[PDB]
Ligand binder design. Structure first.
Ligand SMILES: Nc1ncnc2c1ncn2[C@@H]1O[C@H](COP(=O)(O)OP(=O)(O)O)[C@@H](O)[C@H]1O
Ligand SMILES: [Mg+2]
Ligand SMILES: [Mg+2]
Length: 379
């Protein structure tokens, strides 16, 4: 073999591979190879050819210069049961034979930590798969076609890149980056864009809530109704600021229905408690029930309106998926459904007051998780 099957990762190490202190790493599909058929997707495991004739010679030269040659490739078809692992393995081996140089190959079979642009595969190389030889990121390079290049970026290249995953993988790690044309053909740098949402720019600056004249807490019984996307940070915020103050946390996540949120709310008010309703509550009718509960109990009802944008929330959801196994994944469809349903909270509903909660960065207490949190996690 030379193949290893690990946790959501395949690693192949060709005979002849040596650990080195610098790496020249490459995406596979559309970077080293493309379809022989000229179709966008291969019509079978045999439907491949070396992308540019220049490739094998450049690779030999890189090996001669002391770079360990590495491939990082997303193949989530494997984890999804669409592409048998052994089939992909056979294709890899056929490609490597044609290329004619020793390679180590890492294959992210699933979503999550190992899937470019997240750095999981780089980290595995650095920590586990290089025989302890430290790798200099600055002396290394990553080459891939998923580079966020814009439409009509060169003569004969009308379509924009489908993805920016390769560029973002390099950005997350700190690797110098090039496209296959820039790298193998010495084309000038093409125009590109990164995703509009940049997790590096999320700031811990500014107020915890608005308006600053208001008070986050009430000394007396009340109902607080949270509003926000899944992934807006509702439960976390509540845990940090409200539960620590003695509020009863009514969490839809753990209660399994909104009906149980209602009954739990009524129960807590009956106990003379302060209560916060943790649910998405995008629509007027959902919120209306808790306002009514407040009324029945003769207590005020406030709204905490969590301002996280849909892309901030999706980023948080992907992060949660990578760090919190207990929790179930949130699809784009659930997110678009929230967006479809969303009606801004107003005082016309009967809230005593509405506080806006900006998405303020609160850094993760484990530095490895904080590092992860700062990574682009979507191509
Ligand atoms: N202010 C913040 N800064 C950084 N990460 C956050 C912040 N708030 C929440 N998160 C993270 O984002 C993810 C979603 O948070 P969570 O409280 O579960 O959102 P919700 O309850 O609205 O679904 C979690 O992984 C959490 O650790
Ligand atoms: Mg590619
Ligand atoms: Mg929650």
């Amino acid at each position: 073999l030379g193949w290893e099957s690990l946790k959501k990762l395949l690693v192949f190490t060709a005979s002849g591979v040596k650990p080195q202190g610098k790496v020249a790493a490459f995406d596979l599909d559309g970077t080293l190879i493309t379809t022989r058929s000229g179709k966008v997707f291969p019509t079978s495991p045999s439907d491949w050819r070396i992308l540019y004739p220049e490739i094998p010679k450049k690779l030999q030269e890189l090996a001669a210069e002391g770079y360990k040659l590495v491939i990082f490739t997303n193949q989530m078809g494997i984890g999804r049961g669409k592409l048998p692992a052994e089939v992909f393995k056979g294709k890899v081996e056929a490609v490597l034979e044609k290329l004619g140089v020793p390679f180590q190959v890492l294959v992210a079979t699933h979503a999550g930590l190992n899937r470019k642009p997240v750095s999981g595969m780089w980290d595995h190389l650095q920590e586990q798969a290089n025989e302890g030889i430290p790798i200099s990121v600055e002396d290394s390079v990553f080459v891939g076609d998923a580079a966020g290049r814009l439409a009509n970026w060169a003569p004969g290249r009308k379509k924009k890149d489908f993805s920016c995953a390769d560029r973002l993988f390099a950005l997350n790690v700190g690797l110098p980056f090039a496209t296959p044309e820039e790298f193998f053909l010495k084309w000038p740098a093409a125009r590109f864009e990164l995703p509009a949402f940049d997790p590096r720019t999320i700031s811990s600056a500014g107020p915890l809530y608005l308006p600053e004249s208001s008070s986050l807490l009430s000394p007396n019984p009340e109902v607080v109704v949270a509003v926000g996307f899944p992934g807006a940070g509702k439960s976390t915020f509540i845990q940090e600021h409200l539960v620590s103050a003695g509020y009863v946390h009514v969490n839809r996540d753990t209660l399994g229905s909104w009906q149980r949120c209602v009954s739990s709310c009524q129960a807590a008010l009956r106990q003379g408690k302060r209560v916060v309703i943790d649910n998405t509550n995008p629509d007027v009718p959902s919120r209306a029930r808790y306002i009514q509960c407040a009324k029945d109990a003769g207590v005020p009802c406030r709204c905490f309106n969590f301002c996280a944008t849909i892309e901030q929330a999706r980023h948080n959801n992907r992060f949660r998926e990578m760090t919190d196994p207990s929790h179930a994944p949130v699809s784009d469809m659930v997110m678009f459904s929230y967006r479809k349903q969303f009606e801004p909270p107003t005082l016309a509903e009967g809230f005593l007051e509405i506080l806006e909660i900006p998405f303020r960065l609160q850094e993760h207490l484990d530095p490895a998780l904080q590092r992860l949190y700062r990574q682009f996690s979507e191509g």
